[PDB]
Amino acid sequence: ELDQLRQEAEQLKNQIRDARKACADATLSQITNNIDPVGRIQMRTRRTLRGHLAKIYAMHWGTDSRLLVSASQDGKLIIWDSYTTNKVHAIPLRSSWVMTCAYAPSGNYVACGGLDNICSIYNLKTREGNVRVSRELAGHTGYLSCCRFLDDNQIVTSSGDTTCALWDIETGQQTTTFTGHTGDVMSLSLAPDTRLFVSGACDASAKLWDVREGMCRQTFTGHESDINAICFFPNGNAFATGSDDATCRLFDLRADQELMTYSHDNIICGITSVSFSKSGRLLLAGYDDFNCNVWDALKADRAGVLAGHDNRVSCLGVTDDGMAVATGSWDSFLKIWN
């Protein structure tokens, strides 16, 4: 009886395909031809932060554009100040194989995790002054790829076991669990409404999950390789995803279809990190070609090249106000550009 369900699923997929194709009256390129180009946006290294003993993997800005959290593969969480250049805190991790880090919006807790399959959230405002292990939760049978904070009480964590769950800092238990993708989850990205969040996995699929309802509402399968980066638009209506095919794809939630494909013939390295500015025009994508590229969301033209790294650009992040952009690579140097 498996053939009946197989052909039913195939017919449903074909129906969804022909229903989505009918809504494609015109492309985004045909509409953005009259708008003026963005031009070459030249950027210079404003700040250079050194001190990491290993390769820089994850970084995150807090509520303000001043503090920054970064993780290093030697088991160190560093708190950087972009204005005074002085190190604020240094959290020693029990496991050095960290792959993700997050900063709570309240500015009191910081999460970390990785190959240890244990998510550790530390408190920064401890009355005792020193950093103490606040919540060391476990339960996943896979490596942690990304972690994000929804509020001062809940947290979302991705794992390599294809199953995600919403954890509560008060009790440390899975509040809501999801079905999961087809491959290992690679990255997450929350919406500005804090009610939805879109996740990209190895199956070249991006799924939008809800905090209240534990299920996926839409699915995007426009990519051709493993998706390693994802970032939501500031308005919460679209999101860009970068894959190892040296191509980035902008999927709109309202349109429920791909609108723009950033690609170049000379570019062959895969995308590692994607972030949007405060307006959304400039899309900064880190490539394994030792350079970062800035593209226009409407014109799809190269707006600038950043060659201030000597290794794979592992992470990048734009501040909430768009004053500066931090970039961390495997060269243990953290460059904050204008």
């Binding site: 229903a19 989505r20 809504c23 494609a24 009256d25 015109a26 492309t27 985004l28 509409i31 953005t32 209506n237 679209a238 709109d252 309202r254 349109a255 429920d256 279809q257 609108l259």
Partner: peptide, 8 residues
């Protein structure tokens, strides 16, 4: 789902 022109 909606049209592409409106989203653009």
């Amino acid at each position: 789902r909606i049209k592409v022109s409106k989203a653009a």
